[PDB]
Every structure is written in structure tokens, then in C-alpha cells.
Symmetry: D2
């Protein structure tokens, strides 16, 4: 299920034993770049599963080998998964595995530590009546997540239709993000403790890029 | 989360939107064999996740690239996944993705078609302090399922430590099941409505062996 | 590509660098039961790829988003993958991943070290104009492979339409197999050196069952 | 194995039956998005296997459950897989399954649409003694592909150590490609026939971005 920190009204910590367990193996610096990629997919599928408990259902006539029925379906086409380049791509794999019918978008943001112009790629589906789920493993300073969301907010889509998916966040990041977008939900596997002098999340996972790509 | 039927105190129906959705695509007789197989694996992964919400968590020592910590893990070894042959192997695979470190056992009973449990193959991990999770897509008559559980009971393991996982069950099958084993939790994606003359579940999925194997 | 031993006219050793490399990681006793399952799938997909270079092609009208064409296809329905229970199932996964349209069969054989009756499960598709590919990771004594093939030979299908897929074989096994079925091709990742006092392949992979199932 | 076209001395067409077969299912406009994605990943895994036939093999020390040996392995670290963003990420995934231990780099150029190579993102492993394998489904005009390779050339790496992998290429695209880079091996599943007015490959696959991403 779900867990919340007093400072952060829109942060949710998904603390299922198996998310937690799989997270630790990612945390472990002995874990290979292979297994690290898998766990990335795996956790995020699980997280996608918690977030989607309340998806509306409709029906559709389907023929089973025995009978025609009105069988329950979701409107998967109404969702857009938007990995943040480059480390978010492994996450969207897991969500795309969960909900294959979804639209995929992509956002390219340069890693800045303040509010300058940073965007280098935006590729998005049609915006009409559509929920957007962004993902990036790390929310360290919270600037990259803010800017990524900023892209959708510039295009007129409001907080209520936006979500951000992460693995690990630092409280200083969740705070920056919250200030910029208080109405956008942020889902997280763990709210870690602090940032170091080099802006790495502690205890964190180390440098995401290095562990995904060597 | 989970529904229940007034008739069956130890049957749980996992009705998360994406479980229902994915089940529908399996119900559909036009779904290719490629996809039918993947959906078997997927749904049971999700079903596993619901049923493992209450797993005990302890801590291993682990060093991240940054720091050494006491990180949450699970006792995965204390679990036995047991596909009922032949069709249960697909389900086994999804659970194994979820919990890789678990022991795998096998129960073959095509077989005990009606009269008694007839074991063609029973291969099991050690019993001491172990929870067993049996897998089979269909609980039609209930006899296959009850016999599969008999195998374990007749070797000393109490209901308390046994679970059966299926995709679809008929009410007559669940009755037969629970009369033999009132204390064994049976987990299902759907309780369909009835058996036809050939003892197939309606609306159900068809002949599972056929759709998984041609 | 392919390699051959002078003693064995119908044995083929598939010695691609990546098959070989992936084999070593399986050989390694430090390798987990998880990774061991994956590599099992992976090698056998690769092996399936070498075996199938000469599959006949036909055509089929297909519409691309631009044009209708006569596009190349295989008759995947004409092949049957037949894992030998229980350890062969992971292999058929890889072949089924490669050629999803294939029929799946299953053969249950008891591990004997001589020519007694051993068969406990036979489940097969229609035999008409159909090639059968059996698989089991280990060919130690060669009795299990012989008997498994014996099942198809009893049903009238000749050597020319049969194939056996293995990971590792011992020369004493390849010999027993050859004596019983000289016309049946046997594909192998490595022809290891000898059997030990306990009939384990040396250097081999250890006990297949233990490493797949803990 | 591999075909060649008289016009193109460094283009190789991988025409294994299952590569052709799987390509056809991608060509088909009725193939669901779920399946289209998996087939991208699959085909490139197979294409990788053909192109890695000649990999050097050395030996690590390894102990099997039975004995200690000198077992064949590969120098996987000496390889860089570089998806060309955005569509190349699917291909990257298949190669990574094949060779998990390889370094991943990224080249973003939607982009250098015509006039020059315009790098929106270039992230690369270290160059010293490294073979680079670029990935992109389509070589239509040839400009994307030539620019992606320019990126690496302009940073010092010779043709000798560069390869490009695509699903489908137009002859005009290959000409453009080889004029810029006569010494770079380009690997393809098919050389289709021509470009239409909108610069799409005929018969080709359609808009790849669209079919991968909705």
C-alpha cells in the first residue's frame, strides 16, 4: 500500500514488501548493470499497479470459446507514459508492459540546479482528455522533475491530470517540486534522507546513468 | 483489492482493473497464442503482488555506492511455488519473476480425473516452515485442485500454510474444493457462473491446455 | 556455427561465442537460480536459431501502412516443441519465444539407467506431416533421451522428423542415444568429457533440477 | 546468413527465415502495438547474433558444482550499444539482452533533419579500444544515419570500429549513407525498394515512431 510524510501533501511512498525488497537489490552496489535494468522495469510495473487501482472500467462485447459476453476493460489509450530522457526509459518499459495500449511521449531535459531554460526534446501525443505519467528514477534536487512537468503545464494541461513516478527522492527535491507544482502527485518507492555535497541522494542508488549504462 | 462471495469464506477475488482487463483479453478467442501465454504469466505476477502485501520484512546489511545501511528485504527462500502440471507452468513463471529466490516444486495430476488423487509426479522442496503456493489456471470441477492440495496434506502440511492460485473458478468447483479443504485460501481473478455439459467454465476461457499448447 | 565429433555422425555442437559465453555463466556454481533460469531460455532460443536456417519460406498477402505485398513467412504451425519434464520446460520457453505459433507437446519420463518401461506422461499434438523437437538440458546416460524419443518412434514417426535439443552431453550418453536412434539429430551446446560415479556430467552444470528449482 | 546488393559493398542483409518471418509481422498494419514492440526487440536480438559470430573468446576460471575449469567467455565490456533516439531504444533492448555486460551510449538527432548533424544529446562510453554498434529501425533518406555516425567520427573513432544496425533501408538511403561512410558496416533485415513522396520506405513498416509510440 501507500505511505505519507507530514511535510509533503502530494508525495506517496509505495511501501509494499516486494517493491521495498527489489529496491534494496538495486541499492546494492554489487548488483550488475543487467539486474539493475530488470529491477528498474520490475519495480515500476509494481508501482504502476498501485497507482491504477481506481482506473474506471467499461465493457466491450467479447466472444469466449463458449459465449459472447460484456467483459470488463480499461481505456488504456487515454493514458500517456512519458519517460524523462535518458534514465526514465527503463521505467516506461515496465509501465508499457503493464498497459501496452498507452501513448508514449518523451521529454528531454538538461540537468540544471536552478530555474533556467533546459528543454531540448519534447515529443508528445494529443493532449485532449488525457492523463500524463512522467518517470525518472531519481528526484535529487527536484529541478529536473519540475522542468519536465513545466513542459506539460506550458501546454495548458493542469496539475490534476499530471503524475510523476520516481524510485527514490530526497526531501530537498520533493520540496522544490512541491513549490513549483503543488497539485501534481509524486509517487516514490522511498523517501531517502538527504543530498550529499555532489547532489547525490543518500543512501540512494548512486549515479543512475552509470549503473544503467556502465 | 478483493471481493468475496457469501458462499465461500476462503475464496478471494482479485478485481483490480488491470487484472480484469488482462483477463478479458484472455477470454477473447481471437487473442493469438503468443499473447495468451504472456497474459497468463502477467496476470499471475499481479495476483502474486496482491497476495504478498503482508510479507514480513527484515534487514540485510548492504552498501550503496554512497553509504552502508540496514535495508529492507524479504525471506524469499521460505516460499514454494508449485505449478500443477501441465498448464500451471505459465503461472509459476510470473510468480517466479516476482519472487526469484523461491523454491519451485511440481505436482502432476491430470489425472486423479475423478476417483482418487493419482500422482504421476510429485517433486517438492523441504516442508519445514514453508508456505506453498499452488498454481493452475482453471478450477472447473474442483477435483484437480483438491487432489493437488491432498498431495501436500497427506505429506503433513496444514491448510494454514497452503494457498491455491487460479485464473478462473466455477462455483461448483469452489464447493468441491472447500468441502475437502475448508482452510485453504483459494485466489482467483474471477468467479465465473457455471459449468457446461462438458464441464468447461462459462463464460471462462475455453480449453486452457488447447489455447496454451495448440 | 556448427561443430562435430568423429565418434558421433548425428551430434552437432553449436559453438557460437555467445552460446559458449552464456553456457559458462550457467556452469558457474555461484550463479543464482534466477539467472540460471534466464540463461536456460536464452541459450536455447539461440540454439533454435541455428537449427532453423533452412526452414522453408512461403508468402502471404500482407498490408503495410503503405502497400499490399507478398511477404515471407514460415509455417510455424508445422513444428512441435516437446519439452521433457520437468527440466525441459525452461528450454521450450525459449523456442516458444522464437516460434510462438508452434504446437507444444510434453513427455514425462522416469530417470532410469537401463531399458525398462519409464513413461508416465505423453501429451502430443496431431502427428501428421509434423517435425518434433524434444528438449532436456542434460544428456548424461542418454537413457532419458532415448526413452523420450522412443515415445515418438512407438507412434510411427521416423528419425528423419525428430530432433533432440540439449545443453550439455557426455560422450557415454551420446553413444547410448546413437545406438537406439542413429537417424535422430542431437544438438548440443557442449560435448563435455565424462560421467562421474554419480552419473553427473563433468564438468557439466551440476544437478539441473537443484539449480533450476533450488 | 547474409545477402548483398551489387551496389553496396558494406551493406549486409540478414535473411534468416525467422528474421524475414518476424519482419513480416511488423510490416502488417494489423499487428497490435504490444506485439510490434516485442518484435523490434526480438529481431535485433537475432540480428545481433549473426553479427557476433566472430567474437574473440578467452577463458575465465570458473568452478562448476563438480570441478574447476578454464571456461570460454567474451570481452563484453569492449562493446558499446548506442540507440539513436528516440526509436532506437527498442533495438538497444534486444542487443542488451544478448550482451548484458556491454556499455550503453545514446545519440539524439531527430534532428539534423537535413542540413548538418545537430546533436541534441550525445552521451557515450569511453572510446579507447571499443566497437560501437548504433541502432535505428529505419534508414529512409540516410541523413539521420549518416549524422549519427558523424557524431562518433568527429570525436575520433574510425569506420573500422563502427557498425549501424537497422530493420529496413531504402536504396537511396544506403547511397547517402555509404557516400558519407564507405567503411561503416550497415546491417539490415531488408533492403526495401524505394522512397515515396513523403520519404517513407516502401513497402517498409510505416511511421516507426507512430507504431512504437501511438
Amino acid at each position: 500500500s501507500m505511505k505519507q510524510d507530514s511535510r509533503f501533501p502530494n508525495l506517496f511512498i509505495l511501501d509494499h514488501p516486494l517493491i521495498q525488497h527489489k529496491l534494496t537489490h538495486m541499492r546494492d552496489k554489487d548488483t550488475s548493470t543487467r539486474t539493475f535494468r530488470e529491477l528498474l522495469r520490475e519495480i515500476t510495473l509494481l508501482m504502476g499497479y498501485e497507482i491504477t487501482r481506481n482506473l474506471p472500467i467499461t465493457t466491450k462485447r467479447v466472444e469466449t470459446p463458449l459465449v459472447e459476453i460484456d467483459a470488463p476493460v480499461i481505456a488504456g489509450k487515454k493514458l500517456a507514459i512519458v519517460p524523462v530522457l535518458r534514465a526514465g526509459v527503463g521505467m516506461s518499459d515496465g509501465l508499457l508492459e503493464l498497459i501496452p495500449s498507452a501513448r508514449v511521449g518523451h521529454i528531454g531535459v538538461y540537468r540544471a540546479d536552478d530555474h533556467r531554460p533546459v528543454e531540448y526534446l519534447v515529443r508528445l501525443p494529443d493532449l485532449e482528455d488525457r492523463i500524463f505519467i512522467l518517470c525518472d528514477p531519481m528526484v535529487a534536487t527536484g529541478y529536473s522533475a519540475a522542468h519536465a512537468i513545466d513542459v506539460l503545464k506550458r501546454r495548458g494541461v493542469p496539475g490534476e491530470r499530471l503524475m510523476f513516478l520516481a524510485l527514490v527522492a530526497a526531501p530537498e527535491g520533493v520540496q522544490v517540486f512541491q513549490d513549483a507544482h503543488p497539485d501534481v502527485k509524486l509517487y516514490v518507492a522511498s523517501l531517502d534522507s538527504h543530498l550529499d555535497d555532489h547532489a547525490y541522494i543518500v543512501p540512494g542508488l548512486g549515479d543512475a546513468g552509470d549503473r544503467l549504462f556502465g
